[PDB]
């Protein structure tokens, strides 16, 4: 199983406050630290702190700005990083790490994406990508859907929810004018379509909603 | 504080070859170092700990070696799926320090784009714009020019670029271009035409569709 | 008898004191940059070089609460040494006193 949880974005206002979330399973031991590491587009891992939740105990990278705050739930199992003050150097992904106290980390979440911004919420436009009349083909077809405007990142795109993952590429998004837009493409066998269903799932953790879209011939 | 240096930032290399990165710490930490892969988009993973301690469900092929200060993690017979940022974590003091990365490149074959073009959706078009997205797939090398023409003649304005990471299924890229119009914009033009442009070709690859 | 309840009991205490002294150790040091008693394993081998004396000096408190942590390890380690020695005394004595029929 998934070993531990974290929410998927959270949007911060520069100057606001934010309180991420680490949800731990399997094993667990009063032994265990939880990090937390922090990584802008691009770039590096960089330490954040830890924290011994089984004793309230927490250290910080003493070598940066302090923006962050640990504490834990011991009854749910949470770990949280209250982060403070941001500004927009504060924007990236956090991720939260499991240390059985013997220094590596063996398991990751997923991540939380933070955007620092005044800019607002906005779920995705999702359109199909179906082929013109005129087109021809080979063995194979290339289909794709069009997600736009929408704000903040990330957004997770899949096709037949996870089964058609072979020939697959999400395009990074662009941003214009305070919104985002990207596209994502499939290939499958030119048989197959549209005798075998092809559709886009797209979540938007950000503001809670997941969109299905299927490509239908025009 | 511990400062973990890893060179080189880049690294390509042939499929099927023998790869090294190196992680050189500025003392002696015995071998308290371990290695993490991410991929695109994806979470760090574990490799190797203790220099050379192996991982349950990683490949037999990824090794380390060293101590004190200089680090080696190899890959045998390097392939698609180990196209990956590889990052160096020491634990031998206070507080633990991660190294600033290498990318892992992989030379493959010279490979020509597979263009795609796709005129707006009945969707779009109702809420009052039209995109019109090409997809170029599946391609090597990564240097690649698109051309957007309508009715013959050459538009700029609009047109949007996205360019993927290689591809850690078979070592291409892919890039994709959307020109964006207003229903009006769009309504007013008859064929609109996406060229690529690439090595592999003296003439560029063509897609286009009428609007009729 | 006393001694060996007494050697038997400050043995039991030295392994309860190695295995917290490993946890305290890791929790005061963590921290404190430069810190290399930071991991469990290491920590509990610190523990029971401390409490023998051997005196590798491969690793060693340097925060206050870590130095405490390792005064409590060497008593522990020191108490119990003696109790055992003054038990195996005790036995010795009452045995030759009996080989001697007194
Ligand atoms: C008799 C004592 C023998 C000391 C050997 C420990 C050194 C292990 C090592 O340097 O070798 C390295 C190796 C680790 O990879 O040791 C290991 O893994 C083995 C793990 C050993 C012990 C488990 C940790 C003890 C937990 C103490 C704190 C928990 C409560 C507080
Ligand atoms: C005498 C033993 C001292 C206890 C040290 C506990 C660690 C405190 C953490 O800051
Ligand atoms: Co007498």
Redesign the interface.
Known sequence: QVQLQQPGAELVKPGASVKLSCKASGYTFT?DWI?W?KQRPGH????IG?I?PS?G?A?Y???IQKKATLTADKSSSTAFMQLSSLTSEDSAVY?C?RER??????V????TTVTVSSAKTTPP?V??????S??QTNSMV?L?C?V?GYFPE?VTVTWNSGSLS?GV?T????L?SDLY???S?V?VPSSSWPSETVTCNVAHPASSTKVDKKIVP? | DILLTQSPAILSVSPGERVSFSCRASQSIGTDIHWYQQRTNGSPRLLIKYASESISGIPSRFSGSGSGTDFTLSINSVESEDIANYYCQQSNRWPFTFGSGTKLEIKRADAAPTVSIFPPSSEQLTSGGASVVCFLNNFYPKDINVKWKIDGSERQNGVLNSWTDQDSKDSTYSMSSTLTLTKDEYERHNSYTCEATHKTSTSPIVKSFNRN | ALHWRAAGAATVLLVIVLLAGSYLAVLAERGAPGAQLITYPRALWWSVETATTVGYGDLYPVTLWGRCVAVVVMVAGITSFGLVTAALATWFVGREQERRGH
């Open positions: 032994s990090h590491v590096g891992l960089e330490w830890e011994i004793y105990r250290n990278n003493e070598k991720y790490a106290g013997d220094g590596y980390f063996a990751w979440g997923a991540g436009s359109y199909p990508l179906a082929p013109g005129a087109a290339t794709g069009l736009k990330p072979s590429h395009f990074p998004a662009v214009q837009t990207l596209s493409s290939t025009r």
